[PDB]
Design a protein around this ligand. Structure first.
Ligand code: HEA
Ligand code: HEA
Ligand SMILES: CCCCCCCCCCCCCCCC(=O)OC[C@H](COP(=O)([O-])OCC[N+](C)(C)C)OC(=O)CCCCCCCCCCCCCCC
Ligand SMILES: CCCCCCCCCCCCCCCC(=O)OC[C@H](COP(=O)([O-])OCC[N+](C)(C)C)OC(=O)CCCCCCCCCCCCCCC
Ligand SMILES: CCCCCCCCCCCCCCCCCCCC(=O)O[C@H](COC(=O)CCCCCCCCCCCCCC)COP(=O)(O)OCCN
Ligand SMILES: CCCCCCCCCCCCCCCCCCCC(=O)O[C@H](COC(=O)CCCCCCCCCCCCCC)COP(=O)(O)OCCN
Ligand SMILES: CCCCCCCCCCCCCCCC(=O)OC[C@H](COP(=O)(O)OCCN)OC(=O)CCCCCCCCCCCCCCC
Ligand SMILES: [Ca+2]
Ligand SMILES: [Cu+2]
Lengths: 110, 55, 534, 74, 36, 269, 98
């Protein structure tokens, strides 16, 4: 009836101590990564977000300047520029998934 | 949390696993209605495409 | 019942479904070959009025149905699903629920393929769907779009099946089966799954690139836009040459197991056999552009690909000789599986010599895109992979089904298919050396000689297939009576010289695998208490 | 009395698309940019009129005129 | 060993040359019988 | 343990799943998507209302497949140690296939970059294309993605340690720091000068980053289901396989971004 | 070596406790490339008498006849084994005419 043999009692106390050893190693190494996050990751994002914020506004004024004057018409397209082998099925004939009418025009020079 | 009382319900149910939870009737019934429309409607356009009529 | 077959989780039922789909697609794809032979029997358009379309469409359908719907589901999904768990000793596969979706996405591909054929255009592009001809300007219908979708479904089926076999082999073995001590069929399946895993994604990327270029306006291969139609060749054949080895490596395990049971002596040098089997798979990834010799590559890369492809013959030859060394001393039992294996040993070596003849880039400028190559790959496919499929069926069916199959009526089928296929595929090398191109429906008159002979031989093989269907019917119906009368052979191993008839009847099966020790048919739950080895 | 373009270093192989293209670019930069001498420019002119398909020339002639030539002639 | 091997070896080479001439030389029959 | 008791349990460590209808329901949903998409591309329907329906059914059926997996692992408890190794091994073999899909996309980039085509300019990128500037905005995404790997690491070890306020906070920052990547990538796509239709350059550019973009949206969903399961006491301190495969997924997906940042952004301008 | 071979099957046959073991050892002795020495065969005959099986003793020479490969060497084995065979009573196949 006993099925299994006598308990090892040596695998135990070597399995039940590795669990304590594992959680102890995760306890302090977690504190190490928190120190890295606050003292390395957080300053890095703050010093690159303030830079990107300023450069982004410089681009924004350029983009709204395009609409103001067509002037000399939009730059002409090379032979590989706009490919219309088969018109798009979603809506009008020639507009891609993300279209910004400000910067994408596709004027036809016939 | 509720895992202990959810464990006692899923075990000892003698029902399909997707019908055991008491809230399962809300998902399954609307699903089979939409599912039928999804797998039968494209099959109606097959003979229309074979003839060549474009809608 | 719906639950048993529509909600399948048992691996043996999925194997039976894979088998059942394979025969239907096999009969469907071998009638298009009959129509092709009838159209090529004589010069001039004889049966198809003048339609060059519906000839290329039939060729595409034939190739796809024979490769992706007969050999793949039978060798890998049929035999691999049914036999790998049993020889390893696992009760079922590691992921039993994705094993069902690995099958049920195959019938959807058949619907996509048929509805692609029925649209007014059709897909006359070949099984290698090259971009510029299958672009939107030359094939303007929704046909090749539906053909591409079928390839995605087959690819996802094969990928999900391949992931299942790697995990199943690695950590579902029994109590004594170390990775060093495996049957050779499991080794072949393992290596095949690893080739599939690393080769399928590149095909998926190229095929999706083709789809997006036809419908989403991406200059992926469009010449006007900087695209290169030769990049597609690299992307496709990187899955293409390794592929010709997914269809033969599981064919090697079957032959390895067959020739050591009806020849009562174990395989000569097994570890060298697994080394050579792994080397063919590993080194086949370094030779893909021999299919692209005349595309205009550099002179120095042609030398590399010529030198690397001939190394394939070193391990391959090792497998040919080690098969001839395990039958040298033993006692030979000439049954139907042994007749198929012996025919395979000869026909595959005839195919491989022509293959090494094709491997030289300087000579391939005279043998490329001719019927020479067709005759080549019809020896290793129609006589190398089909024969091991017949040998595997005749080897395992009485154990799997529990029904015998009237030996003398099967040897007739063997001889008919032998002398029928040899008639179709031997004259092709004569047509190829005179410069007869591929993929044409009608040819100059001077080629009418061997084409008639090859067309006569197709009817013999078709008659053999019909006889095989009748053998299936006579096995399922009154097959329990075949082992009562004297129509079939019951024991695959005769007693030894000094072994009496009353001692053979207490040790009936002296096998080196668990497959032949199970009940016939095997139980639904085969292994309750795990089996122990060594 | 037969002759043709000789073997060229840098273009020693089967693929010859760039060899055609460079001669067309070189020819126009030979004339518009410091075209002080007629004779040396003819080496390219007999080199792209050879080895190059005809219809490519008319396509590149329209793209140059319209201002959409990829090559930098100036 | 010369006496024993001779009784079995040499007849087989003659049978050998026959079968291989059939599997490989069969298309010669069709061409001659009536290339016409 | 009595011999009678042991026989009232499985004799093997592998998990036997009951018959299920989802493997075929997803199969039928994949045919409707394949068959409806092939029609709307050429007409034959008229509007794109059936494509949306097919995608919805495809997604909803997949949710009900994952809904069953969490039930048999958390309430029925069929994931023994042997089963857990196969799931981890199966995911590792699945990310290798994902990498090789990207390997086919880098090959397409190097083919047209090392020897640029003649229909393009003699140079690369082609003449008249304003490529994305590597230092202004993509560099913000690079710092963001690296910081995601640092905050999911101590969220993982805090869960092992035993405190739930740091583990729960690490995921919340991880989710919102991935959403910022998706929204910032959305801003650049709608402000770019070139489109997918701009020759070969736009095809390879938007296929590499676009495939990564579609993978980041599936990463946020995976992170979202770990926050629900952690908050409602599903993930335990020593058994979390749905979370280990998420940490491997985000670390592997940072290496792929670094490779896409060196060749598509720096080396390609 | 041959002498080591002969002296180790001379010991294997002396320990064969049933009719399954005798037919297992003799299938091993004749499975080797070498034709066994006449000293080996004599012990095999004794084993068959010990387990009381006449037909396996008859098959000993039938195995030898195909194994010895020489028409005079079969006579050479025949002459030295005349005394033991006649004493035991084993008939040859040709004499028996079965
Ligand atoms: C199961 C299928 C299968 C197998 C196993 C092979 C095996 C080989 N194949 Fe190929 N092959 C195809 C299927 C296969 N092939 C298909 C379908 C095509 C055409 C695809 C298409 O274009 O549509 C093709 C095309 C193909 C080409 C391209 C031809 C062209 O398109 O111009 C080449 C080039 O070298 C090639 C070579 C080889 C070689 C060297 C082997 C080697 O593996 C063979 C090695 C065999 C031997 C070496 C003989 C056995 C060994 C001995 C007897 C030992 C003694 C040997 C020596 C001393 C050398 N075959
Ligand atoms: C497994 C692959 C396979 C098989 C079995 C076959 C079998 C046959 N094929 Fe071939 N064929 C190809 C793969 C195959 N083929 C490929 C890839 C091409 C290239 C297409 C292209 O150019 O695009 C091709 C092209 C091809 C051509 C050249 C077309 C062209 O270039 O224009 C011809 C010409 O006669 C031909 C004829 C035949 C004939 C008469 C048979 C058969 O009659 C031969 C005898 C075999 C059988 C009758 C099958 C028996 C077995 C079963 C039916 C399965 C059931 C059995 C078990 C489960 C054990 N097929
Ligand atoms: C090996 C098994 C058999 C292999 C297949 C043999 C096929 C023989 C064959 O096709 O022969 C037909 C020719 C017809 O004669 P023909 O010279 O070709 O003239 C043309 C006549 N048509 C074709 C229009 C009818 O007539 C012949 O030339 C008949 C020759 C028959 C030779 C014996 C069989 C082959 C050798 C065994
Ligand atoms: C599953 C695999 C993914 C799905 C593949 C099929 C569906 C693809 C749909 C693509 C639709 C499309 O046109 O996408 C366009 C976008 C961006 O294109 P855009 O709108 O021109 O972007 C620039 C916007 N301007 C500058 C104008 C303001 O481009 C993208 O965002 C493209 C993202 C998708 C890229 C797919 C790559 C597939 C590679 C092989 C995958 C094999 C599996
Ligand atoms: C591509 C699909 C995803 C493949 C990668 C995941 C496969 C490895 C993980 C795994 O075994 O779980 C699977 C669940 O994911 C799935 O396969 C469910 C997602 C299916 C997506 C369909 C489009 C199959 O698990 P299982 O349910 O087969 O076995 C459960 C035994 N305890
Ligand atoms: C298409 C590609 C699809 C890829 C699917 C990848 C699946 C990976 C996970 C595979 C199963 C892992 C597993 O068993 O984890 C369970 C939860 O996972 C789950 O149930 C995860 C489901 C969420 C995945 C969402 C991915 C996006 C799908 C988009 C549509 C397709 C519970 O295991 P546990 O050990 O944590 O339980 C502890 C209980 N005490
Ligand atoms: C080949 C050439 C073409 C032959 C055409 C035959 C037509 C049908 C006749 C059937 C006769 C019959 O039934 O043959 C029966 C014979 C004799 O059997 P048995 O001694 O038991 O006696 C039966 C009465 N008791 O067994 C065999 O066939 C077995 C031998 C087959 C050998 C291999 C066959 C496969 C080809 C391998 C490749 C070639 C190897 C050699 C290469 C040079
Ligand atoms: Ca005809
Ligand atoms: Cu190849």
């Amino acid at each position: 009836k006993p099925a299994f043999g006598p308990p090892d009692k040596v695998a135990a106390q070597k399995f039940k101590e590795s669990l304590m050893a594992t959680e102890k190693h995760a306890k302090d190494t977690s504190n190490m990564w928190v120190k890295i996050s606050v003292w390395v990751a957080l300053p890095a994002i703050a010093l690159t977000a303030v830079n990107t914020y300023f450069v982004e506004k410089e681009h924004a004024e350029h983009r709204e300047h395009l609409k103001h004057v067509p002037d000399s018409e939009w730059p002409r397209d090379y032979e590989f520029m706009n490919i219309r082998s088969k018109p798009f099925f979603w809506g009008d004939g020639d507009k891609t998934l993300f279209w910004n009418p400000v910067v994408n025009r596709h004027i036809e020079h016939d | 949390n509720k895992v202990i009382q959810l464990q006692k319900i899923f075990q000892s149910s003698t029902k399909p696993l997707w019908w055991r939870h008491p809230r399962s009737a809300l998902y399954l019934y609307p699903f089979y209605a939409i599912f039928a429309v999804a797998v039968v409607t494209p099959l109606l356009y097959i003979p229309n495409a074979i003839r060549g009529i474009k809608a | 019942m719906v639950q048993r077959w529509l909600y399948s989780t048992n691996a043996k039922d999925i194997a039976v479904l894979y088998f059942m789909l394979a025969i239907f697609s096999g009969m469907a794809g071998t009638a298009m070959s009959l129509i092709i032979r009838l159209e090529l029997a004589a010069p001039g358009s004889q049966y198809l009025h003048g339609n060059s379309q519906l000839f290329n469409v039939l060729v595409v359908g034939h190739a796809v149905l024979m490769i992706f719907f007969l050999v793949m589901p039978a060798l890998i999904g049929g035999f691999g699903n049914y036999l790998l768990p049993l020889m390893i000793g696992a009760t079922d596969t590691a992921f039993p629920r994705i094993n069902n979706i690995a099958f049920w996405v195959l019938p959807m591909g058949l619907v996509c393929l048929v509805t692609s054929t029925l649209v007014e255009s059709g897909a006359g592009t070949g099984w290698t769907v090259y971009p510029p001809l299958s672009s939107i300007q030359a094939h303007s219908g929704p046909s090749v779009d539906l053909a591409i979708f079928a390839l995605h479904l087959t690819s996802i089926s094969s990928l999900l099946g391949a992931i299942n076999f790697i995990v199943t082999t690695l950590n579902m073995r029994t109590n004594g089966m170390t990775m060093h001590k495996l049957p050779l069929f499991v080794w072949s399946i393992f290596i095949t799954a690893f080739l599939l895993l690393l080769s399928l994604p590149v095909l998926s990327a190229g095929i999706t690139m083709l789809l997006l270029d036809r419908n989403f306006n991406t200059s992926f291969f469009e010449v006007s836009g900087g695209g290169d139609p030769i990049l597609y060749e690299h992307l496709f054949w990187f899955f293409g040459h390794p592929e010709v080895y997914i269809l033969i490596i599981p064919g090697f395990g079957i032959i390895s197991h067959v020739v050591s049971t009806y020849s009562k002596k174990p395989v000569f040098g097994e570890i060298s056999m697994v080394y050579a089997m792994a080397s063919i798979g590993l080194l086949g990834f370094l030779v893909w552009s021999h299919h692209m010799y005349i595309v205009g590559l550099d002179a120095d890369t042609r030398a590399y690909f010529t030198s690397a492809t001939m190394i394939i013959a070193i391990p391959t030859g090792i497998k040919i000789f080690s098969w001839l060394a395990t039958i040298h001393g033993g006692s030979i039992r000439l049954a139907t599986p042994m007749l198929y294996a012996i025919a395979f040993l000869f026909l595959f070596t005839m195919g491989g010599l022509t293959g090494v003849a094709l491997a030289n880039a300087s000579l391939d400028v005279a043998f490329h895109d001719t019927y020479y190559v067709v005759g080549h790959f019809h020896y290793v496919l129609s006589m190398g992979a089909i024969f091991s499929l017949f040998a595997g069926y005749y080897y395992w069916s009485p154990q799997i089904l529990g029904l015998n199959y009237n030996e003398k009526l099967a040897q007739i089928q063997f001889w008919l298919i032998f002398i029928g296929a040899n008639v179709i595929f031997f004259p092709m090398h004569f047509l190829g050396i005179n410069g007869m191109p591929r993929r044409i429906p009608d040819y100059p008159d001077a080629f009418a000689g061997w084409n008639y002979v090859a067309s006569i031989g197709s009817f013999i093989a078709t008659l053999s297939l019909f006889l095989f269907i009748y053998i299936l019917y006579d096995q399922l119906v009154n097959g329990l009576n075949n082992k009562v009368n004297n129509k079939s052979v019951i024991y695959n191993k005769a007693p030894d010289f000094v072994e009496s008839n009353t001692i053979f009847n207490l040790n009936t099966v002296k096998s080196s695998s668990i497959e032949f020790l199970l009940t016939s048919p095997p139980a639904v739950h085969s292994f309750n208490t795990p089996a122990v080895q060594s | 009395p037969l002759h043709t373009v000789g073997f060229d270093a840098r273009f020693p192989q089967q693929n010859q698309t760039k060899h055609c293209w460079q001669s067309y670019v070189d020819y126009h930069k030979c004339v518009n940019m410091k075209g002080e001498d007629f004779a040396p420019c003819k080496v390219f002119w007999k080199t792209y009129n050879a080895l190059c398909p005809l219809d490519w020339i008319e396509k590149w002639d329209d793209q140059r005129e319209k201002g959409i030539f990829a090559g930098d002639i100036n | 060993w010369v006496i024993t091997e001779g009784r079995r070896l040499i007849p087989e080479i003659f049978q050998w040359s026959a079968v291989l001439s059939v599997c490989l030389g069969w298309p010669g029959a069709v061409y001659f019988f009536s290339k016409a | 343990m009595t011999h009678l008791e042991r026989s009232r349990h499985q004799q093997h460590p592998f998990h036997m799943v009951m018959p299920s209808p989802w493997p075929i329901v997803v199969s039928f949903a994949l045919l409707s998507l394949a068959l409806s998409t092939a029609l709307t591309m050429h007409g034959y329907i008229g509007n794109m209302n059936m494509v949306y329906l097919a995608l919805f059914v495809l997604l909803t059926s997949s949710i009900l497949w994952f809904r069953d997996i969490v039930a048999e692992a958390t309430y029925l408890g069929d994931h023994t140690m042997a089963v857990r190794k196969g799931i981890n091994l199966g995911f590792l073999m699945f990310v290798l296939s994902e990498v090789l899909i990207f390997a086919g996309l880098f090959w397409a980039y190097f083919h047209s970059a090392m020897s640029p085509d003649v229909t393009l300019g003699a140079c690369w990128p082609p003449v008249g294309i304003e490529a994305v500037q590597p230092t202004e905005l993509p560099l913000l995404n690079t710092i963001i993605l690296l910081s995601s790997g640092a905050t999911v690491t101590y969220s993982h070890h805090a869960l092992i340690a035993g405190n739930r306020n740091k583990a729960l906070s690490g995921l919340l920052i991880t989710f919102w720091l991935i959403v910022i990547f998706v929204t910032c990538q959305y801003i650049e796509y709608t402000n770019a000068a070139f489109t997918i239709s701009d020759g070969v350059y736009g095809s390879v550019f938007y296929a590499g980053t676009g495939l990564h973009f579609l993978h980041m949206v599936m990463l946020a969903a995976m992170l979202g289901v770990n926050y629900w399961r952690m908050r409602n006491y599903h993930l335990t301190a020593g058994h979390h396989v749905g979370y280990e495969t998420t940490i491997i997924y985000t670390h592997v997906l940072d290496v792929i971004w670094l490779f896409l940042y060196v060749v598509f952004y720096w080396w390609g301008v | 070596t041959f002498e080591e071979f002969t002296a180790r099957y001379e010991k294997e046959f002396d320990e064969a406790y049933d009719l399954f073991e005798v037919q297992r050892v003799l299938n091993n002795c004749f499975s080797y490339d070498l034709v066994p020495a006449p000293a080996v065969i004599e012990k095999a005959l004794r084993a068959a008498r010990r387990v009381n099986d006449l037909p396996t003793a008859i098959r000993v020479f039938e195995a030898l006849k195909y194994k010895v490969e020489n028409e005079d060497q079969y006579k050479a084995y025949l002459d030295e084994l005349k005394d033991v065979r006649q004493e035991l009573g084993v008939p040859l196949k040709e004499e028996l005419f079965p």
